Amino acid sequence: AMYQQYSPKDVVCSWNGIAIEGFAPDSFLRLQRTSPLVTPVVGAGGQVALTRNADKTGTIEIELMQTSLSNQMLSAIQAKQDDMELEEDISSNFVIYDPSGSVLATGINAWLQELPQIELGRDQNSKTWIFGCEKLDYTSTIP
Amino acid sequence: PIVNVDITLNTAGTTREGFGLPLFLASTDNFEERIRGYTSLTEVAEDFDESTAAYKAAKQLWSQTPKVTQLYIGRRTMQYTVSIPDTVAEGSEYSLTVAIGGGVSQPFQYTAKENDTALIVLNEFKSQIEASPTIKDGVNASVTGTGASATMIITKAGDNDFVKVTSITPTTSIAATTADTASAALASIETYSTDWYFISAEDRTQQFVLAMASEIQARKKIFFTANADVKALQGTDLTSATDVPAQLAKSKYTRTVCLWHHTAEFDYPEMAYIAYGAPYDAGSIAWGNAQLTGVAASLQPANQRPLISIQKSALDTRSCNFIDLDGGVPVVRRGITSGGEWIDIVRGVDWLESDLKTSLRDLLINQKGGKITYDDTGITRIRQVIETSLQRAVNRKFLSTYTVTVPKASQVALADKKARILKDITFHGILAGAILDVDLKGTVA
């Protein structure tokens, strides 16, 4: 009859031991796998053979308010990570706590990919951070 | 000098850092402290001679392809029983030199003569020691003697934890024996440091080994031991066997590893087995099919030939370890602890804890600027760090999957929030096995 309520104030995203707080007014999280699950190859005679793709990589895009503090805590993290050697790990699990079940995925071995594009104006423009993933696991409540 | 170049004719050795460091509880008071670390065999040789058990264990440890960064040597509290068997005037009957802790020596001189028996001279030595004001505070004396026998037992009394009464000259018939159970030795060792993982002991008595394993099982460390009891090879029914390797299996001590080798007592081969997996990251290694350099197969006590299949079956039934001879290559087999648990599984479980503890301590210490509020955000950060540690475990090919369940902020009682503590977090993991044996068939037609 009625599905679960979706409260965006209860959604908490945490990466690298810090919590990313302060979300853009309109859209603040986007998870997408870089490749489809299967790609069917249709022969000239009409026969179909599936090709089950082996790439589970996804990209996580998160938007924060222009003046949010997290924007200046991820910048410091990125600056510290740049100075690191190659042998040190620069990735950690991207954890999303959503009691509504609206989100399905947790980023496995997520890493920072793109810095936000800074834009200033008479109005406020959000900053869009982009994260990678090793395997964007879609979990389910149903066992 | 612009370029300082030194060329030596010594072969290069490789040192690797793994999880855990070995500790060897000896029975020698060469040093005054309880635990002293050594970084090579040469450093061990500076305080120990080639005939000491500690030097033998160190030599066995450092005969592997990696090096094992450091080795800790533990000292047991040892008592002394001074005897006399002679009783002849004064001559010298002296030079006891009860050292005691701190650094005092206060040696001893010729006690007496004139119809004086070992009882009289030993009682005089006890009285002289009690008279001196640098040793009576921390050293206790007890002249049981019981007539001619004349047993003069000395031991540490108070704060002074070091006692050494070595005496030159045939005049004094000193002895040196350990006077602590497994509990006393372990408590004394842990009072000094607790950053060691592998533990092995010089003492090979059945009672001490059994108690030591019993007390290790309650802790987060692994006890490595060796044995050369023939009765271990004879029986196959467990209830029937009552030797050291047997009761360990009977008691199900998952935290002890027993390796049956014919060179027990005299030598300590389990140190090489420790060094096999010590310098490698815990969980990613398979302790089963191990090749040890310089260690021969488990020879038979009588004919000095490798064991027959029946004896190996008996040892397997006792959940021990033996150095099998596969086609002429001496390989440690079954890599298992007394109790059926794989060594790598136990070490990996201990390492996971050490890693979860380290990661959460890193999160919870570096919060100098502010605080981690008890709302959902703090719980989410803690859960993320836990999941990161578990993913570190998975990437090592120790685990396969994992689930983490954390409580909501509204389901935590006020009693907990007051004590600023977070409880009842649960996580699960699924291991990934390793292959150690192959089953084969054949047709040929």
Residue numbers in the entry:
A (entry chain B): 2 to 144
B (entry chain A): 4 to 448
Wording from the paper:
Bacteriophage Sf14 infects the human pathogen Shigella flexneri. Here, we report multiple high-resolution structures of the full Sf14 particle, including symmetric and asymmetric reconstructions of the virion capsid, empty capsid, portal region, tail, and baseplate. Sf14 virions have a spherical icosahedral capsid of 820 Å in diameter, which is connected to a long, contractile tail that is approximately 1205 Å long and an average of 235 Å in diameter, expanding to 315 Å at the baseplate. Overall, phage Sf14 appears to share some similarities to other model phages, but in different combinations: both λ- and T4-like decoration proteins, HK97-like capsid and portal proteins, T4/Mu-like tail fibers, a Mu-like baseplate, and a P2-like tail needle.
Here we determined the full structure of the uncontracted, pre-ejection tail, including the tail fiber proteins, baseplate, and central tail needle. A helical reconstruction of the tail is shown in Fig. 6A, with cross-sections showing poorly resolved density in the central tube that could be attributed to tape measure proteins and/or genomic DNA.
